[PDB]
Ligand binder design. Structure first.
Ligand code: GSH
Ligand code: CAC
Length: 86
């Protein structure tokens, strides 16, 4: 098992597409839901200064796999083949 963390909000379809991808491939994940604008911007600013992201984030979903920042849904799909090797 690889360790997957996804940061999301409700009413974000790209967050659902990301989760659905993991689910359709039987990959478990831990979801953190941050619905309010205040909580999300604090999370963005925190991550953007944490050293852990590979670009400055300002949307959800944000996906991390084994502690490596992958990105949003576009990035997930771009790496679909490699992630399914893990
Ligand atoms: N240029 C991308 C388009 C992104 C997209 O297709 N939707 C976003 C949801 S706001 C996403 O998570 N897709 C992949 C990504 O942005 O990295 C962006 O910054 O939003
Ligand atoms: C602009 As948003 C909170 O759907 O990533």
């Amino acid at each position: 098992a690889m360790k997957v963390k996804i940061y999301t909000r409700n009413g974000c379809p790209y967050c659902v597409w990301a989760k659905q991808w993991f689910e359709e491939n039987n990959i478990a994940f831990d979801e953190t839901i941050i619905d309010d604008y205040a909580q999300r911007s604090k999370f963005y600013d925190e991550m953007n200064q944490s050293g852990k992201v590979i670009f400055p984030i300002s949307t959800v979903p944000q996906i991390f796999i084994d502690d490596e920042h992958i990105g949003g849904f576009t990035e997930l799909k771009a790496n679909a083949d490699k992630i399914l090797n893990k």
